[PDB]
PDB file of C-alpha atoms and ligand atoms in Angstrom:
ATOM      1  CA  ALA A 112      41.886 -51.150  38.642  1.00  0.00           C
ATOM      2  CA  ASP A 113      45.354 -50.084  39.772  1.00  0.00           C
ATOM      3  CA  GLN A 114      48.098 -52.549  40.589  1.00  0.00           C
ATOM      4  CA  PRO A 115      50.740 -51.073  42.909  1.00  0.00           C
ATOM      5  CA  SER A 116      54.397 -52.184  42.727  1.00  0.00           C
ATOM      6  CA  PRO A 117      54.114 -53.993  39.366  1.00  0.00           C
ATOM      7  CA  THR A 118      57.136 -55.481  37.626  1.00  0.00           C
ATOM      8  CA  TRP A 119      58.772 -52.873  35.335  1.00  0.00           C
ATOM      9  CA  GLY A 120      57.525 -54.094  31.940  1.00  0.00           C
ATOM     10  CA  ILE A 121      53.823 -53.755  32.671  1.00  0.00           C
ATOM     11  CA  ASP A 122      54.593 -50.570  34.733  1.00  0.00           C
ATOM     12  CA  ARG A 123      55.999 -49.019  31.518  1.00  0.00           C
ATOM     13  CA  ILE A 124      53.153 -49.756  29.113  1.00  0.00           C
ATOM     14  CA  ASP A 125      50.364 -47.765  30.893  1.00  0.00           C
ATOM     15  CA  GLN A 126      52.235 -44.404  30.744  1.00  0.00           C
ATOM     16  CA  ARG A 127      53.804 -42.165  28.043  1.00  0.00           C
ATOM     17  CA  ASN A 128      56.898 -40.877  29.834  1.00  0.00           C
ATOM     18  CA  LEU A 129      59.516 -42.103  32.277  1.00  0.00           C
ATOM     19  CA  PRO A 130      60.124 -42.332  35.173  1.00  0.00           C
ATOM     20  CA  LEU A 131      58.146 -45.483  36.073  1.00  0.00           C
ATOM     21  CA  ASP A 132      55.332 -44.605  38.530  1.00  0.00           C
ATOM     22  CA  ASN A 133      55.125 -48.027  40.293  1.00  0.00           C
ATOM     23  CA  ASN A 134      51.557 -48.491  39.070  1.00  0.00           C
ATOM     24  CA  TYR A 135      49.842 -50.645  36.444  1.00  0.00           C
ATOM     25  CA  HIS A 136      46.374 -49.300  35.622  1.00  0.00           C
ATOM     26  CA  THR A 137      43.807 -51.430  33.793  1.00  0.00           C
ATOM     27  CA  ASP A 138      40.389 -50.549  32.326  1.00  0.00           C
ATOM     28  CA  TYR A 139      40.026 -53.996  30.726  1.00  0.00           C
ATOM     29  CA  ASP A 140      41.458 -57.405  31.518  1.00  0.00           C
ATOM     30  CA  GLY A 141      41.073 -59.654  28.449  1.00  0.00           C
ATOM     31  CA  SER A 142      37.700 -61.122  29.500  1.00  0.00           C
ATOM     32  CA  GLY A 143      36.146 -63.150  26.687  1.00  0.00           C
ATOM     33  CA  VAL A 144      39.464 -63.362  24.801  1.00  0.00           C
ATOM     34  CA  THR A 145      41.750 -66.386  24.334  1.00  0.00           C
ATOM     35  CA  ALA A 146      45.516 -66.079  24.042  1.00  0.00           C
ATOM     36  CA  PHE A 147      47.272 -69.000  22.362  1.00  0.00           C
ATOM     37  CA  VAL A 148      50.863 -69.396  23.553  1.00  0.00           C
ATOM     38  CA  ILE A 149      52.881 -71.202  20.864  1.00  0.00           C
ATOM     39  CA  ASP A 150      56.001 -72.092  22.799  1.00  0.00           C
ATOM     40  CA  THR A 151      57.533 -74.684  25.162  1.00  0.00           C
ATOM     41  CA  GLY A 152      54.146 -75.367  26.809  1.00  0.00           C
ATOM     42  CA  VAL A 153      52.597 -73.746  29.911  1.00  0.00           C
ATOM     43  CA  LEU A 154      52.546 -74.822  33.553  1.00  0.00           C
ATOM     44  CA  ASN A 155      48.720 -74.670  33.727  1.00  0.00           C
ATOM     45  CA  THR A 156      48.657 -75.075  37.521  1.00  0.00           C
ATOM     46  CA  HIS A 157      50.780 -71.958  38.151  1.00  0.00           C
ATOM     47  CA  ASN A 158      49.215 -69.654  40.748  1.00  0.00           C
ATOM     48  CA  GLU A 159      49.463 -66.809  38.188  1.00  0.00           C
ATOM     49  CA  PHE A 160      46.701 -68.277  36.020  1.00  0.00           C
ATOM     50  CA  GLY A 161      44.057 -69.100  38.630  1.00  0.00           C
ATOM     51  CA  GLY A 162      42.508 -71.802  36.448  1.00  0.00           C
ATOM     52  CA  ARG A 163      42.512 -69.742  33.225  1.00  0.00           C
ATOM     53  CA  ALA A 164      45.306 -71.795  31.609  1.00  0.00           C
ATOM     54  CA  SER A 165      44.713 -75.063  29.811  1.00  0.00           C
ATOM     55  CA  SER A 166      46.406 -77.251  27.195  1.00  0.00           C
ATOM     56  CA  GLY A 167      45.671 -76.892  23.489  1.00  0.00           C
ATOM     57  CA  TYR A 168      47.946 -79.463  21.874  1.00  0.00           C
ATOM     58  CA  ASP A 169      51.466 -80.798  22.278  1.00  0.00           C
ATOM     59  CA  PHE A 170      53.268 -81.211  18.919  1.00  0.00           C
ATOM     60  CA  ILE A 171      56.458 -82.442  20.618  1.00  0.00           C
ATOM     61  CA  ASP A 172      54.824 -85.455  22.358  1.00  0.00           C
ATOM     62  CA  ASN A 173      51.819 -85.684  20.015  1.00  0.00           C
ATOM     63  CA  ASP A 174      49.086 -85.485  22.651  1.00  0.00           C
ATOM     64  CA  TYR A 175      46.864 -82.965  24.471  1.00  0.00           C
ATOM     65  CA  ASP A 176      49.109 -82.331  27.501  1.00  0.00           C
ATOM     66  CA  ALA A 177      50.882 -79.043  26.735  1.00  0.00           C
ATOM     67  CA  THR A 178      52.605 -78.648  30.127  1.00  0.00           C
ATOM     68  CA  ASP A 179      55.974 -76.833  30.205  1.00  0.00           C
ATOM     69  CA  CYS A 180      59.317 -78.587  30.919  1.00  0.00           C
ATOM     70  CA  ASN A 181      61.508 -75.624  29.930  1.00  0.00           C
ATOM     71  CA  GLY A 182      60.062 -72.502  31.612  1.00  0.00           C
ATOM     72  CA  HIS A 183      60.048 -70.200  28.557  1.00  0.00           C
ATOM     73  CA  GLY A 184      56.347 -70.713  27.685  1.00  0.00           C
ATOM     74  CA  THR A 185      55.195 -70.315  31.283  1.00  0.00           C
ATOM     75  CA  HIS A 186      57.113 -67.001  31.534  1.00  0.00           C
ATOM     76  CA  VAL A 187      55.686 -65.775  28.222  1.00  0.00           C
ATOM     77  CA  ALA A 188      52.174 -66.844  29.275  1.00  0.00           C
ATOM     78  CA  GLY A 189      52.452 -65.052  32.648  1.00  0.00           C
ATOM     79  CA  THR A 190      53.396 -61.802  30.888  1.00  0.00           C
ATOM     80  CA  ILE A 191      50.229 -62.063  28.762  1.00  0.00           C
ATOM     81  CA  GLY A 192      47.798 -63.119  31.499  1.00  0.00           C
ATOM     82  CA  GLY A 193      49.274 -63.658  34.963  1.00  0.00           C
ATOM     83  CA  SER A 194      47.445 -62.181  37.999  1.00  0.00           C
ATOM     84  CA  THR A 195      50.640 -60.428  39.176  1.00  0.00           C
ATOM     85  CA  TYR A 196      52.943 -60.343  36.141  1.00  0.00           C
ATOM     86  CA  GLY A 197      50.390 -60.084  33.370  1.00  0.00           C
ATOM     87  CA  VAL A 198      48.919 -57.424  31.070  1.00  0.00           C
ATOM     88  CA  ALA A 199      45.443 -58.994  30.686  1.00  0.00           C
ATOM     89  CA  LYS A 200      44.597 -60.429  34.078  1.00  0.00           C
ATOM     90  CA  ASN A 201      41.413 -62.316  33.115  1.00  0.00           C
ATOM     91  CA  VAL A 202      42.368 -63.647  29.668  1.00  0.00           C
ATOM     92  CA  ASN A 203      42.039 -67.348  28.831  1.00  0.00           C
ATOM     93  CA  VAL A 204      45.421 -68.968  28.167  1.00  0.00           C
ATOM     94  CA  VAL A 205      45.889 -71.969  25.869  1.00  0.00           C
ATOM     95  CA  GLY A 206      49.242 -73.737  25.583  1.00  0.00           C
ATOM     96  CA  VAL A 207      50.320 -74.915  22.127  1.00  0.00           C
ATOM     97  CA  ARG A 208      53.592 -76.777  22.654  1.00  0.00           C
ATOM     98  CA  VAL A 209      55.901 -76.684  19.630  1.00  0.00           C
ATOM     99  CA  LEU A 210      59.243 -76.400  21.428  1.00  0.00           C
ATOM    100  CA  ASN A 211      60.892 -79.171  23.447  1.00  0.00           C
ATOM    101  CA  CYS A 212      62.363 -79.269  27.003  1.00  0.00           C
ATOM    102  CA  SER A 213      65.559 -77.624  25.680  1.00  0.00           C
ATOM    103  CA  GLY A 214      63.532 -74.921  23.832  1.00  0.00           C
ATOM    104  CA  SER A 215      64.118 -76.348  20.336  1.00  0.00           C
ATOM    105  CA  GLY A 216      61.700 -77.534  17.632  1.00  0.00           C
ATOM    106  CA  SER A 217      61.278 -78.262  13.929  1.00  0.00           C
ATOM    107  CA  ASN A 218      59.747 -75.940  11.309  1.00  0.00           C
ATOM    108  CA  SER A 219      57.123 -78.650  10.657  1.00  0.00           C
ATOM    109  CA  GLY A 220      56.040 -78.710  14.332  1.00  0.00           C
ATOM    110  CA  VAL A 221      55.838 -74.918  14.589  1.00  0.00           C
ATOM    111  CA  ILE A 222      53.665 -74.851  11.446  1.00  0.00           C
ATOM    112  CA  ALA A 223      51.504 -77.628  12.943  1.00  0.00           C
ATOM    113  CA  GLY A 224      50.946 -75.380  16.019  1.00  0.00           C
ATOM    114  CA  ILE A 225      50.079 -72.321  13.898  1.00  0.00           C
ATOM    115  CA  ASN A 226      47.570 -74.379  11.917  1.00  0.00           C
ATOM    116  CA  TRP A 227      46.174 -75.826  15.147  1.00  0.00           C
ATOM    117  CA  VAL A 228      45.359 -72.304  16.419  1.00  0.00           C
ATOM    118  CA  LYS A 229      43.796 -71.377  13.028  1.00  0.00           C
ATOM    119  CA  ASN A 230      41.591 -74.477  13.112  1.00  0.00           C
ATOM    120  CA  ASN A 231      40.669 -74.378  16.809  1.00  0.00           C
ATOM    121  CA  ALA A 232      40.381 -70.733  17.853  1.00  0.00           C
ATOM    122  CA  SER A 233      36.795 -69.687  18.688  1.00  0.00           C
ATOM    123  CA  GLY A 234      35.805 -66.110  19.594  1.00  0.00           C
ATOM    124  CA  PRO A 235      38.195 -63.158  20.019  1.00  0.00           C
ATOM    125  CA  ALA A 236      41.684 -64.690  19.836  1.00  0.00           C
ATOM    126  CA  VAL A 237      45.343 -63.681  19.890  1.00  0.00           C
ATOM    127  CA  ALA A 238      48.342 -65.973  19.327  1.00  0.00           C
ATOM    128  CA  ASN A 239      51.871 -65.300  20.577  1.00  0.00           C
ATOM    129  CA  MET A 240      55.020 -66.693  18.966  1.00  0.00           C
ATOM    130  CA  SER A 241      58.109 -66.024  21.114  1.00  0.00           C
ATOM    131  CA  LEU A 242      60.323 -68.059  18.771  1.00  0.00           C
ATOM    132  CA  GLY A 243      62.005 -67.644  15.406  1.00  0.00           C
ATOM    133  CA  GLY A 244      64.486 -69.099  12.977  1.00  0.00           C
ATOM    134  CA  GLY A 245      65.835 -68.677   9.449  1.00  0.00           C
ATOM    135  CA  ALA A 246      63.560 -67.160   6.790  1.00  0.00           C
ATOM    136  CA  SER A 247      60.834 -69.633   5.750  1.00  0.00           C
ATOM    137  CA  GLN A 248      58.011 -68.840   3.321  1.00  0.00           C
ATOM    138  CA  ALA A 249      56.222 -72.002   4.572  1.00  0.00           C
ATOM    139  CA  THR A 250      56.209 -70.594   8.107  1.00  0.00           C
ATOM    140  CA  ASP A 251      55.178 -67.123   6.882  1.00  0.00           C
ATOM    141  CA  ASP A 252      52.305 -68.610   4.841  1.00  0.00           C
ATOM    142  CA  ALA A 253      50.959 -70.475   7.845  1.00  0.00           C
ATOM    143  CA  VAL A 254      51.033 -67.267   9.939  1.00  0.00           C
ATOM    144  CA  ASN A 255      49.478 -65.108   7.210  1.00  0.00           C
ATOM    145  CA  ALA A 256      46.743 -67.731   6.651  1.00  0.00           C
ATOM    146  CA  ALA A 257      45.899 -67.920  10.402  1.00  0.00           C
ATOM    147  CA  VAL A 258      45.672 -64.112  10.472  1.00  0.00           C
ATOM    148  CA  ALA A 259      43.430 -64.118   7.359  1.00  0.00           C
ATOM    149  CA  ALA A 260      41.274 -66.573   9.358  1.00  0.00           C
ATOM    150  CA  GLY A 261      40.752 -63.923  12.057  1.00  0.00           C
ATOM    151  CA  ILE A 262      43.424 -64.522  14.719  1.00  0.00           C
ATOM    152  CA  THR A 263      45.802 -61.706  15.597  1.00  0.00           C
ATOM    153  CA  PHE A 264      49.396 -63.052  15.598  1.00  0.00           C
ATOM    154  CA  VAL A 265      52.113 -61.360  17.644  1.00  0.00           C
ATOM    155  CA  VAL A 266      55.741 -62.532  17.265  1.00  0.00           C
ATOM    156  CA  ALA A 267      59.237 -61.804  18.604  1.00  0.00           C
ATOM    157  CA  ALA A 268      61.572 -59.861  16.286  1.00  0.00           C
ATOM    158  CA  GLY A 269      64.528 -62.012  17.424  1.00  0.00           C
ATOM    159  CA  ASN A 270      67.683 -61.493  19.518  1.00  0.00           C
ATOM    160  CA  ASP A 271      70.301 -61.202  16.722  1.00  0.00           C
ATOM    161  CA  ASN A 272      70.996 -57.447  16.867  1.00  0.00           C
ATOM    162  CA  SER A 273      70.177 -57.573  13.122  1.00  0.00           C
ATOM    163  CA  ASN A 274      67.499 -56.704  10.579  1.00  0.00           C
ATOM    164  CA  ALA A 275      64.424 -58.706  11.695  1.00  0.00           C
ATOM    165  CA  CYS A 276      63.400 -59.236   8.027  1.00  0.00           C
ATOM    166  CA  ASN A 277      65.956 -62.027   7.785  1.00  0.00           C
ATOM    167  CA  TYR A 278      63.928 -64.321  10.086  1.00  0.00           C
ATOM    168  CA  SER A 279      60.579 -66.152  10.244  1.00  0.00           C
ATOM    169  CA  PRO A 280      57.965 -65.589  11.465  1.00  0.00           C
ATOM    170  CA  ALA A 281      59.417 -62.092  12.213  1.00  0.00           C
ATOM    171  CA  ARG A 282      59.279 -61.064   8.531  1.00  0.00           C
ATOM    172  CA  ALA A 283      55.786 -62.474   7.899  1.00  0.00           C
ATOM    173  CA  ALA A 284      53.722 -59.605   6.407  1.00  0.00           C
ATOM    174  CA  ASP A 285      50.694 -59.971   8.635  1.00  0.00           C
ATOM    175  CA  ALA A 286      52.507 -60.826  11.878  1.00  0.00           C
ATOM    176  CA  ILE A 287      52.786 -58.046  14.467  1.00  0.00           C
ATOM    177  CA  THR A 288      56.573 -58.111  14.980  1.00  0.00           C
ATOM    178  CA  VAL A 289      57.860 -56.860  18.327  1.00  0.00           C
ATOM    179  CA  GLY A 290      61.274 -55.417  19.181  1.00  0.00           C
ATOM    180  CA  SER A 291      62.616 -55.206  22.758  1.00  0.00           C
ATOM    181  CA  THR A 292      63.385 -52.197  25.010  1.00  0.00           C
ATOM    182  CA  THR A 293      65.081 -51.585  28.371  1.00  0.00           C
ATOM    183  CA  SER A 294      63.786 -49.709  31.441  1.00  0.00           C
ATOM    184  CA  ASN A 295      65.423 -46.471  30.226  1.00  0.00           C
ATOM    185  CA  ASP A 296      63.635 -46.737  26.831  1.00  0.00           C
ATOM    186  CA  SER A 297      66.737 -47.863  24.876  1.00  0.00           C
ATOM    187  CA  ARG A 298      66.446 -50.560  22.228  1.00  0.00           C
ATOM    188  CA  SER A 299      67.772 -53.672  24.019  1.00  0.00           C
ATOM    189  CA  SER A 300      71.305 -54.435  22.759  1.00  0.00           C
ATOM    190  CA  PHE A 301      70.213 -57.798  21.324  1.00  0.00           C
ATOM    191  CA  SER A 302      66.942 -56.592  19.724  1.00  0.00           C
ATOM    192  CA  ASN A 303      66.457 -57.108  16.019  1.00  0.00           C
ATOM    193  CA  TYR A 304      65.268 -53.958  14.279  1.00  0.00           C
ATOM    194  CA  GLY A 305      64.139 -52.416  10.979  1.00  0.00           C
ATOM    195  CA  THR A 306      61.112 -52.252   8.678  1.00  0.00           C
ATOM    196  CA  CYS A 307      59.716 -55.687   9.561  1.00  0.00           C
ATOM    197  CA  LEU A 308      59.054 -54.419  13.124  1.00  0.00           C
ATOM    198  CA  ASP A 309      55.611 -53.065  14.018  1.00  0.00           C
ATOM    199  CA  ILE A 310      56.207 -51.900  17.607  1.00  0.00           C
ATOM    200  CA  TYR A 311      58.637 -51.990  20.548  1.00  0.00           C
ATOM    201  CA  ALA A 312      57.816 -53.338  24.039  1.00  0.00           C
ATOM    202  CA  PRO A 313      59.722 -54.023  27.321  1.00  0.00           C
ATOM    203  CA  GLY A 314      61.956 -57.047  26.864  1.00  0.00           C
ATOM    204  CA  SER A 315      65.079 -56.645  29.024  1.00  0.00           C
ATOM    205  CA  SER A 316      64.950 -58.146  32.593  1.00  0.00           C
ATOM    206  CA  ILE A 317      61.242 -59.049  32.592  1.00  0.00           C
ATOM    207  CA  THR A 318      59.856 -60.866  35.634  1.00  0.00           C
ATOM    208  CA  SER A 319      57.085 -63.455  35.216  1.00  0.00           C
ATOM    209  CA  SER A 320      55.998 -66.996  36.154  1.00  0.00           C
ATOM    210  CA  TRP A 321      58.311 -70.029  35.750  1.00  0.00           C
ATOM    211  CA  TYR A 322      57.731 -73.781  35.489  1.00  0.00           C
ATOM    212  CA  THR A 323      59.679 -75.106  38.518  1.00  0.00           C
ATOM    213  CA  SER A 324      56.742 -74.678  40.992  1.00  0.00           C
ATOM    214  CA  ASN A 325      53.262 -73.148  41.140  1.00  0.00           C
ATOM    215  CA  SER A 326      54.754 -70.038  42.758  1.00  0.00           C
ATOM    216  CA  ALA A 327      58.067 -69.881  40.828  1.00  0.00           C
ATOM    217  CA  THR A 328      59.237 -66.735  39.024  1.00  0.00           C
ATOM    218  CA  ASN A 329      62.154 -65.924  36.698  1.00  0.00           C
ATOM    219  CA  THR A 330      63.643 -62.721  35.301  1.00  0.00           C
ATOM    220  CA  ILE A 331      64.942 -63.066  31.745  1.00  0.00           C
ATOM    221  CA  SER A 332      65.582 -60.940  28.656  1.00  0.00           C
ATOM    222  CA  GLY A 333      64.556 -61.236  25.020  1.00  0.00           C
ATOM    223  CA  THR A 334      62.221 -60.166  22.239  1.00  0.00           C
ATOM    224  CA  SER A 335      60.472 -63.333  23.496  1.00  0.00           C
ATOM    225  CA  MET A 336      59.596 -61.277  26.605  1.00  0.00           C
ATOM    226  CA  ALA A 337      58.564 -58.185  24.589  1.00  0.00           C
ATOM    227  CA  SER A 338      56.146 -60.110  22.341  1.00  0.00           C
ATOM    228  CA  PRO A 339      53.707 -61.198  25.145  1.00  0.00           C
ATOM    229  CA  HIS A 340      53.359 -57.598  26.411  1.00  0.00           C
ATOM    230  CA  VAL A 341      51.919 -56.809  22.947  1.00  0.00           C
ATOM    231  CA  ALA A 342      49.810 -59.986  22.846  1.00  0.00           C
ATOM    232  CA  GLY A 343      48.415 -59.019  26.266  1.00  0.00           C
ATOM    233  CA  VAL A 344      47.466 -55.532  25.012  1.00  0.00           C
ATOM    234  CA  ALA A 345      45.791 -57.044  21.919  1.00  0.00           C
ATOM    235  CA  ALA A 346      43.718 -59.059  24.435  1.00  0.00           C
ATOM    236  CA  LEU A 347      42.813 -55.836  26.285  1.00  0.00           C
ATOM    237  CA  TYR A 348      41.675 -54.222  23.027  1.00  0.00           C
ATOM    238  CA  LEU A 349      39.613 -57.308  22.084  1.00  0.00           C
ATOM    239  CA  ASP A 350      37.909 -57.240  25.514  1.00  0.00           C
ATOM    240  CA  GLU A 351      37.151 -53.523  24.905  1.00  0.00           C
ATOM    241  CA  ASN A 352      35.952 -54.205  21.345  1.00  0.00           C
ATOM    242  CA  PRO A 353      35.425 -57.902  20.409  1.00  0.00           C
ATOM    243  CA  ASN A 354      34.566 -56.860  16.836  1.00  0.00           C
ATOM    244  CA  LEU A 355      38.074 -55.815  15.809  1.00  0.00           C
ATOM    245  CA  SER A 356      39.694 -57.787  12.991  1.00  0.00           C
ATOM    246  CA  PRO A 357      43.443 -58.521  13.224  1.00  0.00           C
ATOM    247  CA  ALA A 358      44.152 -55.622  10.840  1.00  0.00           C
ATOM    248  CA  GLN A 359      42.099 -53.299  13.097  1.00  0.00           C
ATOM    249  CA  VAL A 360      43.932 -54.587  16.213  1.00  0.00           C
ATOM    250  CA  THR A 361      47.246 -53.870  14.422  1.00  0.00           C
ATOM    251  CA  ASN A 362      46.127 -50.340  13.522  1.00  0.00           C
ATOM    252  CA  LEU A 363      44.860 -49.621  17.060  1.00  0.00           C
ATOM    253  CA  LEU A 364      48.135 -50.810  18.588  1.00  0.00           C
ATOM    254  CA  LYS A 365      49.969 -48.451  16.242  1.00  0.00           C
ATOM    255  CA  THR A 366      47.661 -45.428  16.690  1.00  0.00           C
ATOM    256  CA  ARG A 367      47.592 -45.788  20.510  1.00  0.00           C
ATOM    257  CA  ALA A 368      51.374 -46.377  20.821  1.00  0.00           C
ATOM    258  CA  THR A 369      53.711 -43.897  22.504  1.00  0.00           C
ATOM    259  CA  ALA A 370      55.709 -42.118  19.805  1.00  0.00           C
ATOM    260  CA  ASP A 371      59.378 -41.191  19.661  1.00  0.00           C
ATOM    261  CA  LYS A 372      60.616 -42.665  22.981  1.00  0.00           C
ATOM    262  CA  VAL A 373      62.873 -45.489  21.848  1.00  0.00           C
ATOM    263  CA  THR A 374      66.546 -44.546  21.623  1.00  0.00           C
ATOM    264  CA  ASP A 375      68.893 -46.338  19.196  1.00  0.00           C
ATOM    265  CA  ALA A 376      65.725 -47.691  17.534  1.00  0.00           C
ATOM    266  CA  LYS A 377      67.601 -48.080  14.164  1.00  0.00           C
ATOM    267  CA  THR A 378      66.789 -46.941  10.619  1.00  0.00           C
ATOM    268  CA  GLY A 379      63.447 -48.290   9.340  1.00  0.00           C
ATOM    269  CA  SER A 380      62.153 -49.234  12.808  1.00  0.00           C
ATOM    270  CA  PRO A 381      58.779 -47.738  13.762  1.00  0.00           C
ATOM    271  CA  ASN A 382      59.407 -45.498  16.766  1.00  0.00           C
ATOM    272  CA  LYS A 383      56.354 -46.764  18.605  1.00  0.00           C
ATOM    273  CA  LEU A 384      56.371 -47.975  22.186  1.00  0.00           C
ATOM    274  CA  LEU A 385      53.542 -50.236  23.394  1.00  0.00           C
ATOM    275  CA  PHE A 386      50.770 -48.368  25.281  1.00  0.00           C
ATOM    276  CA  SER A 387      47.960 -50.323  26.950  1.00  0.00           C
ATOM    277  CA  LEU A 388      45.254 -47.678  27.500  1.00  0.00           C
ATOM    278  CA  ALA A 389      42.479 -46.466  25.223  1.00  0.00           C
TER     279      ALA A 389
HETATM  280 CA1   CA B 539      52.970 -47.242  35.179  1.00  0.00          CA
END
């Protein structure tokens, strides 16, 4: 399929070179794959999802209603799997709410959400974590264990304009850690960087769904916006080949990535820009 006039992020990922061609081509769509969005919740009824979004668990309220009262998780989820704004337009979306209405949460609750995905994922699965905090081996262990259990984890590098290795789950060995770029292929000014990164993806001024109505959109910036582009492409690859392990997904992302495009990428950063096609 070819989507004309896509938002810039997804426009960027299906081509090697600028300028943007105002087209988002897909050969796959994330069919048969589930993307777990560990975040502020998801507005399941948003027009973007067409029924494909449902609640996993809410660790803020302690119940099964993982609706979004912040917006962040809905935006992240639309980048992964929205009809208009999304990479993988037929993926299943499951909200795992670990962040409150103000976008905050405890290490304990985030770990609870990671474990929940590990224990509940069935079939080809990817999990996205557009969130981070101070270095935590407890958090890293939970991520690494969920990955060892067969779920590809994709996480934001963080918005500190610093070495991403200082933060969890960014530094977690088996996380795919995602830095942010702009529409001219610069590292975003806020993007964390360095050897704990695996890949770069569009993260500045990304348009996607928002929680205020079933048709609402928002345009926001962050490694939190870059992460779901990568999670969405993992879902494409797992539709294409449902037999890939997380390690094989990681390798395929890296071998398929566009090389040597990111300017000001910083010492130790992999100069790899997300590429969605096979
Ligand atoms: Ca394009």
